[PDB]
Design a protein around this nucleic acid. Sequence first.
RNA 1: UGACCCCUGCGAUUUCCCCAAAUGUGGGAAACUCGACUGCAUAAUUUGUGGUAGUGGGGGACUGCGUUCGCGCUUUCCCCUG
Lengths: 86, 73, 186, 81, 95, 81, 74, 77
Amino acid sequence: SSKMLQHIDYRMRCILQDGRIFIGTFKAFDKHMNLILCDCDEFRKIKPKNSKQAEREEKRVLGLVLLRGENLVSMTVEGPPPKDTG
Amino acid sequence: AHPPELKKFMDKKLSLKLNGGRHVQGILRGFDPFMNLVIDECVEMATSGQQNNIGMVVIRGNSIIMLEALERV
Amino acid sequence: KLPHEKHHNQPYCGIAPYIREFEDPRDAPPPTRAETREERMERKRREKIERRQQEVETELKMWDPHNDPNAQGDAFKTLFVARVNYDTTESKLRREFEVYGPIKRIHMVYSKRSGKPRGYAFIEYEHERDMHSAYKHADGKKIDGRRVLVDVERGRTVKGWRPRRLGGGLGGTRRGGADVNIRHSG
Amino acid sequence: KLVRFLMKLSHETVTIELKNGTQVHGTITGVDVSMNTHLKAVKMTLKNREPVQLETLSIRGNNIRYFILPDSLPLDTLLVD
Amino acid sequence: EMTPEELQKREEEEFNTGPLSVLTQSVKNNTQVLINCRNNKKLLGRVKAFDRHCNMVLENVKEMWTEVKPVNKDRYISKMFLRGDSVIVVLRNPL
Amino acid sequence: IGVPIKVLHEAEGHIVTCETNTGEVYRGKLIEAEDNMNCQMSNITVTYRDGRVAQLEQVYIRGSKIRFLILPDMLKNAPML
Amino acid sequence: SLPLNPKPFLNGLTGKPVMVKLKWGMEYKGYLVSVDGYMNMQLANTEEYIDGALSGHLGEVLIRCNNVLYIRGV
Amino acid sequence: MVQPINLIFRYLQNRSRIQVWLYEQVNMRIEGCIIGFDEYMNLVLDDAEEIHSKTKSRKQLGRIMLKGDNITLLQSV
RNA sequence: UGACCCCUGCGAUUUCCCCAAAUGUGGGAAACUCGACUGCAUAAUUUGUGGUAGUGGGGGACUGCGUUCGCGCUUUCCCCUG
């Protein structure tokens, strides 16, 4: 099951069933797909009901988060992990 | 099949949240690994301010969302 | 929004307005019903079973069990011993089965083409009473280090009896795996 | 079972629909017993959103609605096991 | 299950005589079938394989649905893989 | 057990946040944790979908009905991580 | 009235007409054919009712269990 | 310690008209005399009546069965 | 990236026989011991089989109620958008 082992510690973006996007450092997982995200931020797409305006983004910092696999839809790499080198 | 540690809330007045935005309030008497609770002196607590007491009732754990203890255990 | 507060503008509808299937006479392709490595095996499994069954009828008509030159003496007197060690000398087989009674004649069967010992022999006692004494005692005897079984020969006594090659016989040393214990004897 | 057949479609291209109306087109690289599939060089299209090309995506099986397989797939030969 | 042995064939007889036999005879006779899914859309096509999970292998399928005046929309898929949980109702050709 | 479960058990006694499928988010001190994600909290702050808040003293929540949980960032220094 | 478990009750309904209402209002009335350990119902000569009113005639219909709301005879 | 299984058995012997709430439906309720139940929590009623809060109409159904997953709350008489 | 050629797969432990540069390096046998490797309890409330459906939004003409004239609810046609 290297498909998941290869991605540990990478900055992955988790897609929620409600349409939210949780971007955080993928730390660990399990058979149920319960993930552990560090320095996660929550995004949600709100429809514009006033006029033809750009989609409204409401960021929200969470820090360390534990997502239940049942609520996780998919996940992809937004970017490499935070480089510790100068 | 480990049951939940609800011994603290036993014989305490609680207020439970249900799935469809429904809420109840009663004193707990027993539980099960599936969170099937039997609460007495229960009130319906409908959307309106009206109150209706029926007493002993049963609730399925599949519909219980959250349970708060009004007596702080 | 929440699943309970979601305003369903177009909830699930029925299927009454969506019946547009094909007519009955427009039957499905008959040749589109088959599978590989599932029927060719069964087809070959049926022939080998039937081929032997057909071959069985031919042998019964040609060969007669009762009318056998090798078989001699009264059938109720003769005895049958199998699982006998190939190294068993004729005298060793006489002296071991003479304890139960005198042996009029003894016949050890051999391979027709190979000439090797078959492993089973027919023992004919002088008196019918002497044989029965061996039926219970001979069964389970140990000759030359290998256990041997003994039962009255049914080739010419039991109605509707036939050997392995004809589908009959007894003992399951080569039956379904883990279904016949080797320790148990006839 | 049947999920074993799903794990045999690695490196092939399909189009999967999600329970939220989202469509995802890409090449398969691995699948599990829970129907969760990992697609590389994939393009996602959320409802009322713009398509986006993702180099990888690991999806769960519960949120899957259905798949769309190629036209030349050997079903009779692939369903033998 | 009632037969906890690993050699249990309860699933076998179930698909042959149980409610799931509607799909077996469909694949046997290669008959079409209409399926109502949780997408509010109806899928009409043939079946080639399935299991206990009600997951069918469809081909030559035609999706159909309606939005809003109510406008109908349909498309075609020659080969697809339908999940079971999202299914609501199934209906074979009543002919 | 699972590694995420262990990270939850060690988080017992500290302030953690929990969101439910009904949208409510509960932030307060954690009392008891279980392998099945059943969490007991005390003096929590609930947030409804509309935005209103309320006050509670002792609360227990089922694990299956939780969307996700927020734990202290310091837990990242755990020996398993 | 002796206790009658749910499984024998549904078993007796087999072959007789039965109406089932779904979680979304729609109903289906037809001749019950068979059921499984999960209550996956299969009907015959089924008629679809929409919002209580008759919608049309379908025939043989296979329905999963987790979608139906309740069941009733006649 | 009284459990739901023993309590449900008591209501059954008493044959009291037990009311039941629906899953995801607050507006709809069902009441009837329970006849039996299985481990799956499915309940069978002898004479069921579907009552709605908004309409207040009691639809007669008769001997019926109800899925356990749809149950939300039990109520006596 | 990779043809050809090798094992059909165990990390650890125990006993017998044998090759041997003979305390090591190896082979032929099993023994019952851990792993979260798989099958069934796993589609019957706690993740691996759904009550999280996806069912819209906006620009022009086009109704009414309240109004702080920004708007909330409500009734129509044509368009761009998914």
